[PDB]
C-alpha cells in the first residue's frame, strides 16, 4: 500500500464529517477535527497530500474493502465484529464519560445510580447531559460551558460533574482540588482501520501514533535508562 | 525566592551524587545524570547558572531548611512524613517495577500473581529479581544484562520480563514487538523539594515539569477538547 500511496501523491482517508470534535465541517466549509489532524500528520510523514473522502459512517468499511480509500479515521470504535473485517491501529483515543467530585469529600460515586439524591452539574446537550437526564432522582444543573459546571462543583453547589473522559482529565490535571471518582463509563476505544493485508501501512501508522505520544520527558528517560 | 535566585545569578541545588543514573560522578569528575539534567533545565529557564551542592542524602532536608540550597533534586521519594516538612513538586519519576510481554499475544499480566505458572526473565539481583523470586510458582530466568532478559522474552523462551518502569519504557520505545502490560507495581515516586514558603519557585518548577511531559498528542487533545 505505501508505494502505491507515494506514487499516487496523496493518501485517501474515509471519514463521516458529522462527529465534532473528531471530524466535522467548520464555519469555512472545511473538514477539520481531532481525527483530521491525525490524518494530516500521517499524510505529511508519508510525503503526500491528504485527500479526505467524506461519506456516511456505514459506508466506510465497504469503501475501504473496495479500495476506494486507503484508511478510515472516523471515531471508529475497535470491536470484535469489526476486527473480523478490518485491521486496527493501536487505540488512539479513549472515549467515554467520567464522574468528577471534590477531592476533600468522602463522596466517591462509581455509576449514575450513585448520583441519585445528589446535585450533578453537566454541560448542556453533551453525552453527560443526556445520560444523567434519564435519572429522575438526580437534581441536574446545566451549564453552557463545562468550565462553569466544574466551578459549580468547586463551590460546593453541585456534588458531581459528569463529562467526557478526555476533557475531564485535562481539566482535573489543572485543578488538584477535584478528582475523577468513577472508571470510564460506556468506554470505547477508537482505532484507525486499514485493510488486513495492508500491514505496511498499519505499522507505519502505529509508528506515527508512537511518535505523537512521545514527550521530551520520554526522551530524557531514553537518554539515561537505555 | 525567584527574585533572590536571579539576583545571585545561580540556582543552588542539593543532591547526593551516589545514585546513578539520577546523580553520579562521571569519568572526569563531573556530577551528571537524570536529576542533574532536570536541574540544568530549570536553571537555564530561570536564566542563571546551576550550582550543585553535593552532600550526603540525610543532609539534604536540613540544608534546604537552613537555606543553604534552594531546592533538592536527588532521587527523593515523596512520603507523608517528608510532606510535613517540605513542599514537593508534581511527581517526576515512578520508581516501581513493570511487567513486559510480547505484543503478538493475548497474555496481559497486571500483577505478580498473574505471573504464577509462567516463566519470567530478570536481570540478576535487581529489584525485579528480588520481587519475583518471592513467588513460588514463577519460573525465574536470570541474566546479567537486562537486554538479554528481553532477548529471552523476544525469542519466546520467557513469557514476561519484570524491570523498573524507566528502563522498561526506554527499551520498549525501540522495540514495538513488546508491550508494557501492567501499571507500576508499587507507588513510590520522586519529587523535587523546596521550602514551603517558596511557592513561586515550586510553581515555576511544576511548569517546567508539565511542559517536559507534554507530547504532541497532549497538545492535540488540548486543541480539540478545550474551551
Author numbering:
A (entry chain A): 1 to 226
B (entry chain B): 1 to 227
Quoted from the paper:
We identified the arginine binding protein form Thermatoga maritima (TmArgBP) as an ideal system for arginine detection. Additionally, in contrast to the vast majority of SBP that operate as monomers, TmArgBP forms multimeric assemblies at room temperature. The secondary structural elements and protein organization in distinct subdomains (lobes) connected by two joining fragments confirm that TmArgBP is a type II SBP. One novel element emerged from the present study is that the protein forms a dimer through the swapping of the C-terminal helix.
The structure of the apo form was solved by performing multi-wavelength anomalous diffraction experiments, collecting data at three distinct wavelengths. The structure solution unveils the presence of two independent polypeptide chains in the asymmetric unit of the ApoTmArgBP crystals. An analysis of the intermolecular contacts established by ApoTmArgBP molecules within the crystals, carried out by using the server PISA, clearly indicates that the these two independent molecules constitute a stable dimer. Similar to other arginine-binding proteins, ApoTmArgBP is folded into two distinct lobes, each consisting of a β-sheet core formed by five strands, surrounded by helices. β-sheets of lobes I (residues 23–110 and residues 210–231) and II (residues 116–203) present topologies β2β1β3β5β4 and β8β7β9β6β10, respectively. In line with unliganded SBPs, the two lobes of the proteins are far away from each other and do not establish significant non-covalent interactions. Indeed, the two subunits in the dimer mutually exchange their C-terminal helix (residues 237–246). An important role in the swapping process is played by the hinge region 232-KKSPY-236 whose extended conformation hampers the association of the terminal helix with its own subunit and favors its anchoring the main body of the other polypeptide chain. Using the program DynDom, we computed a difference in the closure angle between lobe I and lobe II of 20° for the apo form, whereas no difference was detected for the holo form. Indeed, the C-terminal helix of Apo-TmArgBP forms interactions with residues at the closed interface between the two lobes of the adjacent monomer, an interface which is not accessible in the Holo form, since locked by the arginine ligand.
